[PDB]
Amino acid sequence: MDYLHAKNIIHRDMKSNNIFLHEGLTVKIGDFGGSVLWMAPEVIRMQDNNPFSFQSDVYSYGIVLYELMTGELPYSHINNRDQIIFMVGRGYASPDLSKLYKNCPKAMKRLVADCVKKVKEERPLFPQILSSIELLQ
Amino acid sequence: VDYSVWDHIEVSDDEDETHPNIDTASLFRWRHQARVERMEQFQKEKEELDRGCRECKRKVAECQRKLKELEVAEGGKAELERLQAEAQQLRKEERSWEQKLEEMRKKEKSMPWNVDTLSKDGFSKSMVNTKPEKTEEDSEEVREQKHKTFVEKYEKQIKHFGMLRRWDDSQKYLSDNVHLVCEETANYLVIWCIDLEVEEKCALMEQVAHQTIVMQFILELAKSLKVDPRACFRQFFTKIKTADRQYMEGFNDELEAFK
Amino acid sequence: GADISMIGQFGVGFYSAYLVAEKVVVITKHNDDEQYAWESSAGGSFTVRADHGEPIGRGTKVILHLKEDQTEYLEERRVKEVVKKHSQFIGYPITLYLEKEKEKYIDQEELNKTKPIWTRNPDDITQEEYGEFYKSLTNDWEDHLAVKHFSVEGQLEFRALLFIPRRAPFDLFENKKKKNNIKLYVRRVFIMDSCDELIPEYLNFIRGVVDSEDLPLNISREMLQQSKILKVIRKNIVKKCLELFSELAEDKENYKKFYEAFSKNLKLGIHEDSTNRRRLSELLRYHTSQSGDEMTSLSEYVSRMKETQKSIYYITGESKEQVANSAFVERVRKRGFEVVYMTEPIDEYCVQQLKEFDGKSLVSVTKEGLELPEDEEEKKKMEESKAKFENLCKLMKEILDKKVEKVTISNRLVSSPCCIVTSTYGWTANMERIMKAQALRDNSTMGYMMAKKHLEINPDHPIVETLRQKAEADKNDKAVKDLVVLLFETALLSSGFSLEDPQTHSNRIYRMIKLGLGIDEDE
Amino acid sequence: RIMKAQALRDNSTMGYMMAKKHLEINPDHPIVETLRQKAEADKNDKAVKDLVVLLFETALLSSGFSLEDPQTHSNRIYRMIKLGLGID
Ligand SMILES: Nc1ncnc2c1ncn2[C@@H]1O[C@H](COP(=O)(O)OP(=O)(O)OP(=O)(O)O)[C@@H](O)[C@H]1O
């Protein structure tokens, strides 16, 4: 994602499926991927027809990072389609931290909690996120 | 010698700029998509440019026609004066569309080259080589036609071959052997070691040994495989193996002694 | 717009003579002046002298005096090699002079016999003359199968010629890295061999030359200063030699002769060319249950494909007849479907990527969950069969539980007791066989790509009916346990798995022969 | 095995290169002893003809050679297993 965003290249709806996991320690982004969408609310609304800005993908990365941390769909028990569409689009919802694993140490679980807080924010942090996760390893 | 025209080129489907953490085949189709959408928004900008140009060009021209009418039989200045303010506003707007017309052709120059701006096709032709003829001729007339043309060739071979059983004459020979792609040669050199078996001198028959052992091995492989003896080739004669040395002299004795 | 182009731009090339010479002399005579001699040792100064030697009339003589280290440039073989490599397409004749041995003398001509025929218009060139060029270009004994001549105009201007050799060369699959099949010329002087940038790896069987009038050359004139322009050439070349195949595919008797010679190379590019695999898949042909004597196109399958089929049925294995007899195939034959036969190791690698054709998915006949469209009078039989056999399949797992993931009644069998099929994701039996046999692949990480074996039994076939009667009396009877390993081994063996312990099966059939010969107790 | 599994086989040339088989029999073995006694009692016995092939195929498998048609080995093994199950 860091190497990607440096080229002004945006694909909407970055998700846990369009990524592929292969033989060896080997995970790699693809394009193959109602249907199961994950979105920043700016994209959901009719308001601006090119919601192209990098922050959307950063927050969608934050969603797939919570999938990595939960191993189960965000909002899996909480909602049906009406509530999960409406409350998220209104900026009025969060997936539960109950499913986020406590075998994670404080360093990365706090960084993932900041990946929830980024819904409130306009910050294209990707190289600094990369630094942060790297160093916390 | 300025090469600055070539400085910036965009190539989707380039393997020299794939990120290791991305599926390479996904990135090409995805990078191609961005190019075409960028181009279409810039084509749309040419349409909105031309819309702005057409409106200014027309409304200045309608103002100019009414100005020329109002100059005929002058009197009641309000129209003729207000049309100077309309001409001024329409010209000020037109100068912004002229700035956009310059910005258009400047951006067309300033965008990188790509696979279909660099090029347009010229002539193009595709041909299929409908096969050469196939034929058959009598064993006597083909062996006569080879022998009568080979009276110079096999003399030129025993002379150019003339250093024994090593690399040297292969440098001269293998190009001349393109004539001998048609050869059926197995007869002649041996009919020649047969020619004076009672009396012949050792050097020239030891060169038949060499020619015949190398060629006859090749012909056995050409029966043993699909190959043409020009296509399979004397690269294999580099081999140090005991199968050349021991077996060569064993057959030299057999083939000399029996006749 | 005068009609000459020359190689002059840089102005440094003459001083390259001092790579080889210790001293250089130039006698010239130009029209409208007298003859002069120019001499230097590259020592920072030179001298110009009116010459009084033999009359030249008009021209230049360049006399190199050689360094001892460079004596080999005097020899016939190295002058031949260099002029053939670099300069064989200069328009004007190139001539050499040497001695004979009757005894005295020769002169030699035509170091550049062959004309650069891609300069001529394609309407004015005969199919014989193209073949005559090709022979020399490639040093081959035999003519081309097909040829393409094209040009491009605008900012990147070039002529090109493309040849399809009639039979693959012995070394084609090999990696000697000469990459000399495509030659790049600027203004009829040789720049470089292709070095894998002008044509993709799998299309390297193409012989041809590209000629352009100007390009940003490196100071030594061996290289391009802007490397991306080679890629813009390759996108033109690749596109057009694809078109060439299609035209070649309207000539059926030549097409089969091409395809048998180069078919794998198409398939190798399905595995690697993510863009053109739409186009390349239309060039494929295979044997099938219908017309078993001659291959058919993948579109033709669709043309004949019954209105009820949702997918293209295929099977892969070690030969045509071994596939045609295989136990998975009887039901689809009986029901009038068409099975594609895929009998080469490379088919696995193209079938991994060719997931669909013409909007229809490809379904393996040798995988679990195989769907063949159902009749309600069959569906009721399947339900009551599933009901009555439940104990046998449950007990069969209870014995065999290590080896199979799942056990069920078969839907693809007729005339066989049982068969073994793999999970949807992972290597089927044939891809295991091939991956195990690779010289330089680490198979230790197979765990995520190996499929799991699901066993299926023929509910109609006597042996399985008898086995439910045998199992009925005693669920724990070892004699029925002993079948469900012997039948499993016999079914594995037919499905392409190796016995990891072949001696056990052997000793079973040798104990079977001790029955057949009446010596089972050695008496 | 390995040559047949290569992706870039060059299959015609290897189809020539594949080398031929020699069968070896154990003189002391009850099977060879029996088969000989059977073949001496009748040289033309269809039972010894049917035996020699069934025996032969088993030796391909134990030696690393795949069958030309694994299905007909299995049909012949099922012709035996129908005796083994008393079916027919
Ligand atoms: N045999 C010749 N006859 C006439 N002019 C010549 C001859 N040899 C050299 N020249 C002159 O010498 C000049 C220098 O040639 P040189 O090869 O060094 O540079 P160039 O040909 O112009 O460029 P390049 O380095 O690419 O070959 C030429 O441009 C030409 O004016």
Residue numbers in the entry:
A (entry chain D): 456 to 488, 507 to 610
B (entry chain C): 2 to 260
C (entry chain B): 120 to 220, 273 to 694
D (entry chain A): 604 to 691
Sentences from the paper on this structure:
Importantly, more than half of all human kinases depend on Hsp90 and the Hsp90 cochaperone Cdc37 for their folding and activation. Importantly, for RAF proto-oncogene serine/threonine-protein kinase (CRaf or RAF-1), a member of the Raf family, the Hsp90 cochaperone, Serine/threonine-protein phosphatase 5 (PP5) has been directly implicated in its dephosphorylation and inactivation.
Our cryo-EM structure of PP5 in complex with Hsp90:Cdc37:CRaf reveals how Hsp90 both activates PP5 and scaffolds its association with the bound CRaf to dephosphorylate phosphorylation sites neighboring the kinase domain. Beyond these features within the kinase complex, two new densities were visible. Instead of sitting atop the PP5 catalytic domain active site, the PP5 TPR domain was disassociated from its catalytic domain and interacted with both Hsp90CTDs. The PP5 TPR domain α7 helix made an end-on interaction with Hsp90, nestled into a groove between the two Hsp90CTDs. Here, the PP5F148 and PP5I152 residues which were solvent exposed and disordered in the PP5 autoinhibited state, were stabilized by Hsp90 hydrophobic residues (Hsp90A: L638, L654, L657 and Hsp90B: I680, I684, M683, L686). The PP5 TPR and catalytic domains are separately bound to Hsp90, liberating the PP5 active site for activity and placing the phosphatase domain near its substrates.
